[PDB]
Amino acid sequence: PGAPGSQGAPGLQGAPGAPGSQGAPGLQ
Amino acid sequence: PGAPGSQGAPGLQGAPGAPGSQGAPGLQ
Amino acid sequence: PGAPGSQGAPGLQ
Amino acid sequence: SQGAPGLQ
């Protein structure tokens, strides 16, 4: 029955990141 | 004692959400 | 029964 | 008994 270390919650996201400065065309 | 080492850690993606790196140059 | 491990990944992009 | 990390 017990199994310390067996499959728990399947890995999702885990190490999410993020885009940096997406910028915007404030020019012309 | 269940199934040893059953964890299925994907460890992929899990971070790339909002994509896009435009940094639309401006100023001028 | 056994244990359906991960038949889906909740979330989105 | 148990002994799991997980998630964010």
Side-chain angles (χ1 to χ4, degrees):
Chain A
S6 176
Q7 62 88 29
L12 284 195
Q13 296 295 322
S21 189
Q22 180 94 30
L27 74 174
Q28 190 250 314
Chain B
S6 301
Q7 63 84 30
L12 73 165
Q13 174 47 222
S21 315
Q22 68 190 0
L27 270 174
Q28 68 203 14
Chain C
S6 175
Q7 285 65 0
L12 56 79
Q13 284 79 68
Chain D
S1 61
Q2 271 50 57
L7 288 66
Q8 288 289 110

